């Protein structure tokens with residue numbers, strides 16, 4: 001019910017206490033999903049489930065500055081399943097983005113991009129049916 005890739009404007013950027021909620025369903029034969037919190041052409045926070053990286057499922061997080069990817073942060077907890085509905089919650093906290101999937105804490109990602117108020121778009125892409133994408137202040 002939303003078209004992927006989908007752009008969600010974040011007006012005035014992000015700020016601590018801002019909660020972003022993404023609902024959708026992973027496609028049957030999924031390979032990849034990405035959420036990109038963007039500051040212009042930079043990617044402040046890339047959140048990238050890979051369903052088949054050398055026959056392993058991994059989430060890769062990173063930042064893109066001046067077209068260059070930095071040091072990846074990985075982990076092995078992988079809550080997504082092909083064919084199944086998911087909820088991703090991204091809570092902006094003072095020193096990191098905090099991600100929970102299906103109401104279970106997954107990971108945190110320390111802020112590398114410091115101008116939070118310039119992180120003004122969220123891109124959602126890859127092998128999903130996207131139901132909804134929104135934000136609220138908690």
Ligand SMILES: O=C(NC[C@@H]1O[C@H](CO)[C@H](O)[C@H](n2cc(-c3cc(F)c(F)c(F)c3)nn2)[C@H]1O)c1ccc(F)c2ccccc12
Pocket residue numbers: 032033034046048050052053054060061062069070072125126127
């Ligand atoms: O391409 C690999 N790595 C290089 C780069 O790593 C970055 C993070 O450090 C971004 O994820 C880069 N990236 C990812 C995307 C992307 C685009 C989309 F439209 C999506 F829907 C999506 F989910 C992801 N765009 N840029 C990626 O190309 C990669 C290397 C070795 C392996 F073995 C891989 C196995 C499966 C998938 C990817 C690989």
Ligand SMILES: [Cl-]
Pocket residue numbers: 112113114115
């Ligand atoms: Cl910055």
Ligand SMILES: [Cl-]
Pocket residue numbers: 114115116117118
């Ligand atoms: Cl700021």
Ligand SMILES: [Cl-]
Pocket residue numbers: 004005124125126127
């Ligand atoms: Cl896409």
